[model samples]
Target: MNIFEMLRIDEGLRLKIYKDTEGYYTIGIGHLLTKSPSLNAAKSELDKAIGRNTNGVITKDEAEKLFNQDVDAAVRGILRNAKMKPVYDSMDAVRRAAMINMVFQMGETGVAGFTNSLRMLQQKRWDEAAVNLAKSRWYNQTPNRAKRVITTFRTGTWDAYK
Candidate 1:
């Protein structure tokens, strides 16, 4: 019903640091430690932006909270990005989640690189926007995920909800 549910379905919780897009140390539901301002500070917050710690390992409950925090941060990141923010602000709730889902995988730095494609999205050129999105290496890296997000944007629908 909301972004959290969609995010859970898209990015399953993980209890260990793993490499993600553009090669960052990621944990939880797409939380990147490298992006965090402080590693120790991040760790202190109880799986704030990490997975496993000395005491034990991140729990299902901890990851759930981290998931929401991480999602909120990505939304902030989208707002910070000039290219993404304009269209992102204008997007409907469902499509906005698609953007967050995309920024969820990569980061504003990665998504902002889709300059030309972003232009299309801003103009509401759905198919054209997806055309460029599908042409990226990110698409090849996770083809299925890419298609689902792209379809959601293209159709202005919540097909990715499942």
Candidate 2:
């Protein structure tokens, strides 16, 4: 529920190639496509991932599959990087999604780079942690999303988000 709801809040559902606000070519619920050779090639990859090769526009089910896969990838990616895994393990679904949501958008290193924020979060100083989040370029890049995540951190509940 946290992953799905968080994805809905941050990532959007889409069926075709289009530029995101940051100009990255994206498709299928915020799946970045800039790395792929072509739309069709990526389509083939996703089709293979879901065991089907539908032609024309990608289906909603395909988008949902990619969405779920992205979340799973983000979850593992956070775990793969040892630095934050312990802290990540010690949280509820809402709190976990706050970190996962950040990691999903910015990747492990970006989230890791928020040194003071992570430190404060680890110390359970929720407000200080969110304050650090406000003092970053990522916060500026997508201020609204950052605000939501910051609120999640401060309250340590899904009250504002769920």
Candidate 3:
């Protein structure tokens, strides 16, 4: 199904779409004013956590699909703010995806306000990139998610095309 249809936007659930380390579709969810992008990232991490826990024993495809919709909405929320667009536009897809995951989970204001990481990114320092990511309130919140994505960023092991 098309992404729009997959998300079920008409139902009013929120969305924020980010690319995972492997460049796979990642999603976030929650209400507009009440939503936290960090929570949304947590939710996505939880989905991966659950998927791993079940060892594919349970298929939560429908719920995950719902999440993508929410992430799309959340990202849009960030993009909507004129001040935040330039920084977002400059990120590489993987970095942007990671940022979006964090942003979608953390919230536009929360993520955009990430001064250190943003500066590191601007400088193109990968070591600092890893360090900067670990400094978030959401860091270690989903240990697996944090490790996987951070490693992906650090090692360049997970390419978007792959």
Candidate 4:
């Protein structure tokens, strides 16, 4: 499914700790809540976590596999807990993918913070929805990615950044 495309579209190419999201430590294409380690110990610890050599790096293919393995839990958790089953079920593939991607990146509870954007999306307001998505701290932090996501929301196209 090229799930890594979504990761790349939103996350860029982070080989190490990049920034915090929603007050939690993050790394590796949005693997959130990772505990901080001393710079001296970080590389070896990360390698151990990922089952790689001490000096080895994470590959795109490996990242994709990890994402693929975890996406189902993200999707299922969203569907089970978000109380948006009808809305999610009615969406097209691209829309569904976008929603799942958001949940993956933001966590279901974090995504629920997008009240206005979600409302507009539910109402099928493409332009307004896109605009609403752009009016967030996330957008301010990652304008380029936010633009890509806004395009996806507006056009329902999976090829927004492909």
Taking all chains together, the TM-score of candidate 2 against the true structure is: 0.85
Give candidate 3 regions above 4 Å deviation.
1-65, 155-162
Pairs with backbone N, CA or C atoms under 3 Å apart (clashes), candidate 1: none
- For residues 1-162, what per-residue lDDT tens digits would candidate 2 score against the true structure? 567777787887778766676876677778775655466765665556557665535779877888888889989998997778877886766788899988888888888888778777778888888888899888888888888889998887876665
Residue 91, model 1: Cα distance from true site in angstroms: 1.9
Local distance difference test, each candidate: 0.76, 0.78, 0.53, 0.69
lDDT at position 23, candidate 1: 61
Candidate 1 global lDDT: 0.76
- For residues 1-162, write the lDDT of model 4, one tens digit per residue: 345577656765555544555444444666552455454355555565677773535676655555666687777876886555556676777887778877787678878778777778888888998877888887887677667777887899866777
Ordering by lDDT: 2, 1, 4, 3
TM-score, candidate number 4: 0.73
Best by lDDT: 2
Question: TM-score per candidate, in order?
Answer: 0.80, 0.85, 0.52, 0.73
122-161 in candidate 3: lDDT tens per residue? 5667788788788765575555556555655565444422
Candidates 2 and 3, the one with greater lDDT: 2
